[PDB]
Design an enzyme around this catalytic site. Sequence first.
Site, PDB file in Angstrom:
ATOM      1  N   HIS A 181     -13.018 -10.207   5.947  1.00 26.05           N
ATOM      2  CA  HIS A 181     -12.668 -11.228   4.973  1.00 26.05           C
ATOM      3  C   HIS A 181     -13.563 -11.233   3.741  1.00 26.05           C
ATOM      4  O   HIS A 181     -13.248 -11.923   2.780  1.00 26.05           O
ATOM      5  CB  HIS A 181     -12.721 -12.610   5.638  1.00 26.05           C
ATOM      6  CG  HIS A 181     -11.549 -12.907   6.511  1.00 26.05           C
ATOM      7  ND1 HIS A 181     -11.106 -12.110   7.552  1.00 26.05           N
ATOM      8  CD2 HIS A 181     -10.710 -13.975   6.475  1.00 26.05           C
ATOM      9  CE1 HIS A 181     -10.040 -12.685   8.101  1.00 26.05           C
ATOM     10  NE2 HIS A 181      -9.793 -13.825   7.482  1.00 26.05           N
ATOM     11  N   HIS A 236      15.330  11.126 -14.558  1.00 24.63           N
ATOM     12  CA  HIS A 236      16.097  10.808 -13.359  1.00 24.63           C
ATOM     13  C   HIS A 236      17.542  10.549 -13.727  1.00 24.63           C
ATOM     14  O   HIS A 236      17.876   9.463 -14.224  1.00 24.63           O
ATOM     15  CB  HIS A 236      15.503   9.577 -12.686  1.00 24.63           C
ATOM     16  CG  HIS A 236      14.087   9.742 -12.283  1.00 24.63           C
ATOM     17  ND1 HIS A 236      13.032   9.652 -13.169  1.00 24.63           N
ATOM     18  CD2 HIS A 236      13.565   9.958 -11.060  1.00 24.63           C
ATOM     19  CE1 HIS A 236      11.910   9.840 -12.493  1.00 24.63           C
ATOM     20  NE2 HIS A 236      12.207  10.030 -11.215  1.00 24.63           N
ATOM     21  N   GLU A 245       1.098 -12.279   0.008  1.00 24.50           N
ATOM     22  CA  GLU A 245       0.316 -12.158  -1.225  1.00 24.50           C
ATOM     23  C   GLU A 245       0.973 -11.250  -2.240  1.00 24.50           C
ATOM     24  O   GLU A 245       0.956 -11.529  -3.440  1.00 24.50           O
ATOM     25  CB  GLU A 245      -1.110 -11.659  -0.964  1.00 24.50           C
ATOM     26  CG  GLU A 245      -1.950 -12.520  -0.059  1.00 24.50           C
ATOM     27  CD  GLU A 245      -1.722 -12.282   1.420  1.00 24.50           C
ATOM     28  OE1 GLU A 245      -1.013 -11.307   1.773  1.00 24.50           O
ATOM     29  OE2 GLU A 245      -2.280 -13.075   2.213  1.00 24.50           O
ATOM     30  N   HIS A 271      18.360  13.300  -7.902  1.00 24.62           N
ATOM     31  CA  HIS A 271      17.576  12.083  -8.073  1.00 24.62           C
ATOM     32  C   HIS A 271      16.676  12.155  -9.297  1.00 24.62           C
ATOM     33  O   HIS A 271      16.609  11.198 -10.078  1.00 24.62           O
ATOM     34  CB  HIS A 271      16.740  11.818  -6.813  1.00 24.62           C
ATOM     35  CG  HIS A 271      15.526  10.990  -7.070  1.00 24.62           C
ATOM     36  ND1 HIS A 271      15.576   9.621  -7.151  1.00 24.62           N
ATOM     37  CD2 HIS A 271      14.243  11.336  -7.338  1.00 24.62           C
ATOM     38  CE1 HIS A 271      14.378   9.151  -7.447  1.00 24.62           C
ATOM     39  NE2 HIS A 271      13.549  10.173  -7.567  1.00 24.62           N
ATOM     40  N   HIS A 311     -13.200 -18.098  -1.492  1.00 23.76           N
ATOM     41  CA  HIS A 311     -13.923 -17.436  -0.411  1.00 23.76           C
ATOM     42  C   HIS A 311     -14.363 -16.042  -0.868  1.00 23.76           C
ATOM     43  O   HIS A 311     -14.083 -15.008  -0.258  1.00 23.76           O
ATOM     44  CB  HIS A 311     -13.110 -17.449   0.870  1.00 23.76           C
ATOM     45  CG  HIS A 311     -12.834 -18.835   1.363  1.00 23.76           C
ATOM     46  ND1 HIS A 311     -12.082 -19.763   0.665  1.00 23.76           N
ATOM     47  CD2 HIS A 311     -13.211 -19.427   2.525  1.00 23.76           C
ATOM     48  CE1 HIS A 311     -12.019 -20.866   1.400  1.00 23.76           C
ATOM     49  NE2 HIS A 311     -12.702 -20.698   2.522  1.00 23.76           N
TER      50      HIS A 311
HETATM   51  C1  LIG Z   1      -3.043 -17.365   6.227  1.00 23.79           C
HETATM   52  C2  LIG Z   1      -3.990 -17.102   7.421  1.00 23.79           C
HETATM   53  C3  LIG Z   1      -3.733 -17.472   8.693  1.00 23.79           C
HETATM   54  C4  LIG Z   1      -2.520 -18.168   9.171  1.00 23.79           C
HETATM   55  C5  LIG Z   1      -1.692 -17.353  10.142  1.00 23.79           C
HETATM   56  O1  LIG Z   1      -0.703 -18.232  10.676  1.00 23.79           O
HETATM   57  P1  LIG Z   1      -0.186 -17.687  12.075  1.00 23.79           P
HETATM   58  O2  LIG Z   1      -0.218 -16.214  12.057  1.00 23.79           O
HETATM   59  O3  LIG Z   1       1.100 -18.305  12.346  1.00 23.79           O
HETATM   60  O4  LIG Z   1      -1.300 -18.208  13.100  1.00 23.79           O
HETATM   61  P2  LIG Z   1      -1.384 -19.436  14.087  1.00 23.79           P
HETATM   62  O5  LIG Z   1      -0.133 -19.639  14.807  1.00 23.79           O
HETATM   63  O6  LIG Z   1      -1.437 -20.637  13.120  1.00 23.79           O
HETATM   64  O7  LIG Z   1      -2.607 -19.364  14.815  1.00 23.79           O
HETATM   65  S1  LIG Z   1      -4.942 -16.992   9.821  1.00 23.79           S
HETATM   66  C6  LIG Z   1      -5.857 -16.361   8.423  1.00 23.79           C
HETATM   67  N1  LIG Z   1      -5.212 -16.548   7.211  1.00 23.79           N
HETATM   68  C7  LIG Z   1      -5.617 -15.973   5.924  1.00 23.79           C
HETATM   69  C8  LIG Z   1      -5.061 -14.542   5.688  1.00 23.79           C
HETATM   70  C9  LIG Z   1      -4.251 -14.315   4.622  1.00 23.79           C
HETATM   71  N2  LIG Z   1      -3.810 -13.073   4.352  1.00 23.79           N
HETATM   72  C10 LIG Z   1      -4.159 -12.047   5.143  1.00 23.79           C
HETATM   73  C11 LIG Z   1      -3.661 -10.678   4.752  1.00 23.79           C
HETATM   74  N3  LIG Z   1      -4.904 -12.197   6.215  1.00 23.79           N
HETATM   75  C12 LIG Z   1      -5.388 -13.422   6.491  1.00 23.79           C
HETATM   76  N4  LIG Z   1      -6.183 -13.528   7.576  1.00 23.79           N
HETATM   77  C1  LIG Z   2       9.539   7.481  -3.687  1.00 27.29           C
HETATM   78  C2  LIG Z   2      10.046   7.338  -5.140  1.00 27.29           C
HETATM   79  C3  LIG Z   2      11.347   7.286  -5.492  1.00 27.29           C
HETATM   80  C4  LIG Z   2      12.502   7.340  -4.571  1.00 27.29           C
HETATM   81  C5  LIG Z   2      13.335   6.076  -4.562  1.00 27.29           C
HETATM   82  O1  LIG Z   2      14.514   6.368  -3.815  1.00 27.29           O
HETATM   83  P1  LIG Z   2      15.679   5.367  -4.220  1.00 27.29           P
HETATM   84  O2  LIG Z   2      15.090   4.062  -4.569  1.00 27.29           O
HETATM   85  O3  LIG Z   2      16.663   5.371  -3.152  1.00 27.29           O
HETATM   86  O4  LIG Z   2      16.277   6.028  -5.551  1.00 27.29           O
HETATM   87  P2  LIG Z   2      17.529   6.940  -5.847  1.00 27.29           P
HETATM   88  O5  LIG Z   2      18.713   6.483  -5.129  1.00 27.29           O
HETATM   89  O6  LIG Z   2      17.162   8.254  -5.129  1.00 27.29           O
HETATM   90  O7  LIG Z   2      17.609   7.177  -7.251  1.00 27.29           O
HETATM   91  S1  LIG Z   2      11.610   7.061  -7.179  1.00 27.29           S
HETATM   92  C6  LIG Z   2       9.837   7.158  -7.368  1.00 27.29           C
HETATM   93  N1  LIG Z   2       9.163   7.353  -6.174  1.00 27.29           N
HETATM   94  C7  LIG Z   2       7.711   7.281  -5.983  1.00 27.29           C
HETATM   95  C8  LIG Z   2       7.196   5.838  -5.723  1.00 27.29           C
HETATM   96  C9  LIG Z   2       6.553   5.566  -4.558  1.00 27.29           C
HETATM   97  N2  LIG Z   2       6.035   4.345  -4.334  1.00 27.29           N
HETATM   98  C10 LIG Z   2       6.160   3.380  -5.257  1.00 27.29           C
HETATM   99  C11 LIG Z   2       5.516   2.050  -4.952  1.00 27.29           C
HETATM  100  N3  LIG Z   2       6.804   3.557  -6.388  1.00 27.29           N
HETATM  101  C12 LIG Z   2       7.303   4.779  -6.655  1.00 27.29           C
HETATM  102  N4  LIG Z   2       7.922   4.932  -7.845  1.00 27.29           N
END
Ligand SMILES: CC1=C(CCOP(=O)(O)OP(=O)(O)O)SCN1Cc1cnc(C)nc1N
Ligand SMILES: CC1=C(CCOP(=O)(O)OP(=O)(O)O)SCN1Cc1cnc(C)nc1N
Lengths: 675, 675
Positions: free
Chosen positions: A476, A25, A413, A259, A464
Amino acid sequence: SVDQKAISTIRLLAVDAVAAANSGHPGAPLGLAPAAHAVFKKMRFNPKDTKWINRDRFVLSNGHACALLYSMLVLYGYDLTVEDLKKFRQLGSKTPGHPENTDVPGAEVTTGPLGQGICNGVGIALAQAQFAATYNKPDFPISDSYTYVFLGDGCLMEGVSSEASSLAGHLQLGNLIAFWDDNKISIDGSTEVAFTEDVIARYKSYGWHIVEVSDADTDITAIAAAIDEAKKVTNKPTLVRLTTTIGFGSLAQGTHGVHGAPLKADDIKQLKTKWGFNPEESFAVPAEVTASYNEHVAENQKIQQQWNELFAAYKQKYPELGAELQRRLDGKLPENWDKALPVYTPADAAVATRKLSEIVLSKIIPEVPEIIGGSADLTPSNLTKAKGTVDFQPAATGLGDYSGRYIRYGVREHAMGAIMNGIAAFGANYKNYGGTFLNFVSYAAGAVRLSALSEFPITWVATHDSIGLGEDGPTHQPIETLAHFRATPNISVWRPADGNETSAAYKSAIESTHTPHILALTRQNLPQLEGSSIEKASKGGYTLVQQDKADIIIVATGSEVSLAVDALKVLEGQGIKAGVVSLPDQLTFDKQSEEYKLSVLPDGVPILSVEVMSTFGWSKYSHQQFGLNRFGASGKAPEIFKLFEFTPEGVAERAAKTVAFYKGKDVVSPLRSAF
Amino acid sequence: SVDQKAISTIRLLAVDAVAAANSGHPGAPLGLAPAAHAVFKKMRFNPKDTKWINRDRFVLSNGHACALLYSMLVLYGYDLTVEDLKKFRQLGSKTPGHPENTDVPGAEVTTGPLGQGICNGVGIALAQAQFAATYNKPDFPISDSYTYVFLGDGCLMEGVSSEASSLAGHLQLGNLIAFWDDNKISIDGSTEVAFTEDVIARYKSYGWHIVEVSDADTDITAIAAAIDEAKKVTNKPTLVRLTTTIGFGSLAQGTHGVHGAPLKADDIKQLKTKWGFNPEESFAVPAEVTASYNEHVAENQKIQQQWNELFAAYKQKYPELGAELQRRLDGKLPENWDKALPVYTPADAAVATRKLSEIVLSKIIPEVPEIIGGSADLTPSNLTKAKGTVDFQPAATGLGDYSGRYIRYGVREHAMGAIMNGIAAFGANYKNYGGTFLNFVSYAAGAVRLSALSEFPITWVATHDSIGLGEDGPTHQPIETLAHFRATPNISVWRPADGNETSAAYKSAIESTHTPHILALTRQNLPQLEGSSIEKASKGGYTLVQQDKADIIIVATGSEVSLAVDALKVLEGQGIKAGVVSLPDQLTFDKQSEEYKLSVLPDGVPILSVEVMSTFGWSKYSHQQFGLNRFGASGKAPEIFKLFEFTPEGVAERAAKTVAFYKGKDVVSPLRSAF
Ligand SMILES: CC1=C(CCOP(=O)(O)OP(=O)(O)O)SCN1Cc1cnc(C)nc1N
Ligand SMILES: CC1=C(CCOP(=O)(O)OP(=O)(O)O)SCN1Cc1cnc(C)nc1N
Ligand SMILES: [Ca+2]
Ligand SMILES: [Ca+2]
């Protein structure tokens, strides 16, 4: 000028490396060379001591641009040479096609998967703030370093970077300085086709400071000034918008074609001649560039020399803190720290392994200062915070302090996973953890895999773990999750059955230096097992119930070990003698001696596995597998176990069928193989 | 008023459902009942025809709040009753703890994993725009429906929602109307601890329109007005900020404790009495509420009746388009569409399976109008766009049109996955696909798993499948990825070896109605195989080279089938006769009859698997496994294969060792089991 010559040298080293490999690249290296030159001139680092704890850190989040990074490291006299650049992208070289921290001196993290590096930079900066808050004293700025990150459009499109950027803004991480390569080109062409958001307005909404450099193809004065400005803003991370031309200087500059493929030979010739280089020469390093860069190295080495004297004076004035800091920089845990691990007997009450984990953390956090961690908005469910600790927050919020030990990651996460990698990458023996439900560790797979490839001792507190969670139902309840991570090289996946096994899992996770851990923990209570101990569980797999005349051995993990023990009792009423093996971590078990492993899984006896998840992988350890290869259900957990026949009687039935199936057959250990 | 009574009824049904289960989430249902009432009164839907193609769609992205959704569906007379609400969260009920589209009438998608539903809503809206552009004519608004999404703070923290929201803003999706439950509470407490960004400013930066409703606990007039305002803004998706009190009305309103556990009995009593309900009664449905809701249903049914007449008139005026639309609404592909699939012979040149995939798409896209798809910024690498098609873009950009068929997802794998689920959920027989490198499908695991649980026929075009990609190195080279997805229930994971197998994989993917597909495709060229055909590959596994006196059978996939055939030749020189099985899709193979499967993997002969990835899963089909259980390397691909001994000689050596290992042993098919 010499600075202009250095920038040309960087550009041409990168292009020549891509040319020699006929792969890689050139575009972003050409566009970012001025900024790289400017940033490295501001950074404090020692090419001869890549682990100096007060170095500034650099992260190339747009890791495909690594010919740029390698060129900087070569020019500054890291343990990487022009001969290594000539081997870019070649099997076994120190210059792989994306940077790997295990292989490349001066690569802090492993990048290439877009979005990760900026999040790793957030974690390096988080760690630096926590570390400084822990150790700095009046007249003793033990830690005062910055974290510099380069990122591109692709990183800004990946959701993980949004998560980390929201959190970094919330955390007021003023020593983080990121640089966006604003070149308006990605693989599919103009960013107008897919990426028209107002990035700057978004970063302001997160609480970042912004500096814009309109002519970053040439204006290194403005790039240096942007760094100075960012350093004055101590309560916000800064995004520096570098408006560049991808492939600057190439005939094909400003196009997607530059690129990701080598330049044409005639293009490289015209680059060289117009920058004053010999078009017949490759890998040129003008000695004046080396001299200029060496001056900066020598100054940085004198800074580190003075830091070493500051550290010696710190140990005199603050003897306890100084000894703790020294031990951490030596990579050693406190002597006998593991005496704090809780120990249980079979007379103790049943406890969920999530609660056992809380108790472990409660005992070891006060004993091991380099443990910090958090949860992705699941603190009261994962049970990841020790009572009496304070949250990691900027003091200005009133909600915590940078000396705090508990991180509120929010519902993030993937960024939590990549931030954990950055905390580990900071060094200083940090042993950091992150809680979520096991099924949602999968949201962070991009980062988890990089923990394994990067050899970082991070820990997921993944509660869990199964249908045992009950009513939340199949969205879940993990099925595939342990198989996924067990199939990834270099991941210890602990699924402890009881109190002693949970302590063994933490002993492994905290002692780790090169292997990430996932601790799969229960919602529901489990009994303390007769025969468990930290000592035996530390082997990863062990004989829980030895039966010298076994008709069958049942191998199980986690919540299913108690089930196996109950099935043994049913089987005795049917005239079948069983042994039980507990296999809390397959990776640790695999690393034991062949003789030890055969003592657990011997020849001459059928072996049945039991685990309420996918059967994938289990044939390594068993002849027959009782698992769950369909999605779960929403209901009270005991009713789900009954539905799927994960009951003492259901296990016994399958064990009896296994004994019958091998009647008259010669059986050798599952550990045997042809090659 | 009756509207106030309806809102109270909704609130109390939800709380009573949680109470009966002694499990679930009362807080968001209490806070969002006014908005749910207002939105459903604006929506066009038929509880007796959940598949009416011009219905407005509703998505509950904060799926934990599903007692709210179920209450709405019950009150409106969907095929869900109060008796089902009484069985909330109970094993086997129609009211699981998070909504499942397969189980719950009126649940468009499966939510619960945060962030997914809003992205699914983006996909429903994308599909509606594409569908309307394809079919609407003057005086014939065949499709003019809206997509309404409820989401919370957790969804807004998850990076996947940022990806989809950036893209939706770019795509000017004016029929998308999302509602943020701005209640300032998540599981860890106040959003001040982790989520302090200016959400509204961020959504403006994406190009969304904003409406703020400051008193969404009561002001249904303002919520209705916000919908009217959103409908006037035809070129931007709208975010409606609903400032609510979590748990509104509860003694514990405004606290994290009301998020996720049943209310206390005394709290439920005071809720009832102050809203005019009997505190001794549960699951009350005032008949005036039923009457009011039935009036709206009757009006909606008259709207659908008129739509059916419009459709009949459309078929008269536009006979070709009308027949196409009818066929799609019947769930049928074009007659004999598969005659467009390319067919190859062993005399044809070697071709990479990514290029074979491009050729398939080129042939079938013109034949099957319900195919649309895109790539996550990898269009020229995945080879996912057919020449002569236009991109899906708002015409105002000049870059495409809503009638276009090719989507520029940008570097947004996770949102691409969840958007694909929404396109599938729209219906009308959409068969949609998304390209990325196989290793980065893992970024989208949260959505992929939901494709499987939701039974959506989406397709991942997952190129650069192995170490065969070469120089990009181990951060790009899959190891665990196929094992992960094969271990997930209901995912067809095709790894075609050649041209005929690639056509079979697409035949399966496009014909699918309930199973998502991942097509693992090569960077590198592979030969056309002697013995392959669409017919045989359609069985998922088949005998490629039959050897009646086999000493060993080699089972392989993808790029390793040609390797196995070359190893057979080496083995013949060593005096060993081998057969070869090609296993392009394990799931399809598993679904064949037991007799068919045993004809491929018979008793009485050792079987060796060969695939340059994890060995997990392979013991289903083999006695010994030759795979790659470590990370890859950066170098030219043939050199990596040589390093790891994936060569004809290396396979032959392991085959000879396998024959030796089973000398004097009785061997039964890997397909046999004890239970
Ligand atoms: C953190 C979490 C929750 C709080 C939401 O907080 P919120 O959206 O603001 O909901 P509320 O206003 O409190 O009712 S639910 C379930 N859980 C675990 C949870 C974590 N990660 C993912 C990807 N999905 C989930 N389900
Ligand atoms: C799409 C992609 C690229 C373009 C970036 O585009 P950019 O950040 O704007 O780079 P640039 O200005 O063009 O040099 S690289 C590699 N690849 C595949 C690629 C896709 N998804 C993830 C998670 N990682 C990667 N590596
Ligand atoms: Ca770019
Ligand atoms: Ca909330």
